[PDB]
Design a protein around this ligand. Structure first.
Ligand SMILES: N#Cc1cn([C@@H]2O[C@H](CO)[C@@H](O)[C@H]2O)c2ncnc(N)c12
Ligand SMILES: [Zn+2]
Ligand SMILES: [Zn+2]
Lengths: 301, 116
């Protein structure tokens, strides 16, 4: 295999370069399940593998790093994914999370409500989203690009992701958005990463590595999702929990990446090159302030 | 004058034979850590499991005020190490036990400060 000892499998570059037509996703391992370590939740395993894969990329990791995590609640009322992110991230990292439904979290701050109600004054170094509507998994209707929280995520990235920052956004066969794929071309590199514990599902994390704030590559997002499904359809991934048992190198290395404020005119090619290598973050280093919009109604008489 | 006594209530519910609070978030870790009780990152040793702190706090989990004039949570945002033998009820364990203020180990489950 070799793959079975990795945290998961990233979409090989050649599949990105195709021009496939969208088909239904039919996974051979559908219904297989990995053998999780005793007492470990799927979400803990899935996030652990996501973070293990992110350890292999050129993530910018500044002092006073700012991370925001959408879709962080569970039907259990807790935040397993947040707990893994906080273990992974350097101590002191500012971590905010959010969900439509109430939950209790280890994040430094939590906002409950539709993500579209969330606003922040500051920019972020990493955005993680596990947001998902299981009503999208309806095989009897056409599989078009979805709006909803994906429209929010696309705007949030363009407006509040620091240059140099990275994202990991969860998609599935039916939960996807063409503009989000298009926005992957505004990073120095991108992939769709499938965790080995959840390889029986069409889930992937769309990862954009080192944001550049402009298109480096023009991506047609309808075509790219069809390319992703083609890859999944033709490359069965063996369910595996092997990587969960070795946590010795798990922590994200505190690189102390430089943070600079810069105006548009100053983003020359030497800056762009540092951004592309994970060596620079561009944003203000002010205080982190967030809020949730609250709709007020009085239904008396 | 009136305050709900949530700690006592869980204790009595347990003694009455009720099932312990579940869905405490157990972490993957090396299990070669310091063994201290409450830490900024998982520190379980070979005899412990590490858990996300919020999910093991009675007050966090039951949406009640924290027993503290400040309402500050001892566990939220940290990791709590629980002896493997007691890991079926982390909330009970954290409630019924106390951390040595000198060495950071659980009194009776790592703290050796009272030894000759
Ligand atoms: N559609 C939708 C959304 C789904 N979720 C949450 O994603 C998690 C799915 O694993 C779950 O806990 C859910 O409550 C959303 N959270 C905020 N805003 C939204 N618009 C959504
Ligand atoms: Zn608490
Ligand atoms: Zn002691």
């Amino acid at each position: 295999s070799s793959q079975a000892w990795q945290p998961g499998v990233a979409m090989p570059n050649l599949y990105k370069m195709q021009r496939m037509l969208l088909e239904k996703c039919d996974l051979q391992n559908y219904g297989d399940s990995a053998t999780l370590p005793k007492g470990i939740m799927m979400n803990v395993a899935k996030y652990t593998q996501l973070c293990q894969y992110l350890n292999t990329l050129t993530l910018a990791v500044p002092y006073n790093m700012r991370v925001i995590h959408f879709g962080a609640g569970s039907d259990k009322g807790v935040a397993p994914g947040t707990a893994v992110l906080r273990q992974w991230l350097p101590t002191g990292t500012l971590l905010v999370d959010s969900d439509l439904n109430d939950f209790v979290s280890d994040a430094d701050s939590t906002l409950i409500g539709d993500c579209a109600t969330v606003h922040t004054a500051n920019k972020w170094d990493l955005i993680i989203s596990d947001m998902y509507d299981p009503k999208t998994k309806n095989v009897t209707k056409e599989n078009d690009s979805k709006e909803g929280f994906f429209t929010y995520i696309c705007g949030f990235i363009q407006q509040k992701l620091a240059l140099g920052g990275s994202v990991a956004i969860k998609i599935t066969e039916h939960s996807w958005n063409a503009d989000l794929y298009k926005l992957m071309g505004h990073f120095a590199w991108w992939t769709a990463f499938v965790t080995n514990v959840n390889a029986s599902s069409s889930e992937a994390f769309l990862i954009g590595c080192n944001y550049l704030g402009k298109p480096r590559e023009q991506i047609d997002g309808y075509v790219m999702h069809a390319n992703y499904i083609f890859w999944r359809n033709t490359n069965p991934i063996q369910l595996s929990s092997y990587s969960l048992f070795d946590m010795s190198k798990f922590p994200l290395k505190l690189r102390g990446t430089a943070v600079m404020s810069l105006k548009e005119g100053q983003i020359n090619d030497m800056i762009l090159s540092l951004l592309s290598k994970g060596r620079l973050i561009i944003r203000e280093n002010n205080r982190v302030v967030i809020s949730s919009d609250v709709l007020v109604n009085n239904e008396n008489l | 004058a009136f305050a709900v006594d949530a700690a006592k209530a869980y204790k009595d519910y347990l003694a009455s034979g009720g099932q312990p609070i579940t869905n405490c978030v157990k972490m993957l870790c090396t299990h070669t850590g310091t063994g201290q009780a409450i830490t900024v990152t998982p520190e379980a040793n070979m005899d412990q499991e590490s858990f996300g702190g919020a999910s093991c706090c009675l007050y966090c989990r039951c949406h009640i005020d924290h027993p503290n004039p400040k309402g500050f949570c001892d566990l939220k945002g940290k990791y709590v190490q629980i002896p493997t033998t007691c890991a079926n009820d982390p909330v009970g364990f954290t409630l019924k036990n106390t951390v040595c203020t000198v060495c950071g180990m659980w009194k009776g489950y790592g703290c050796s400060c009272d030894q000759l």
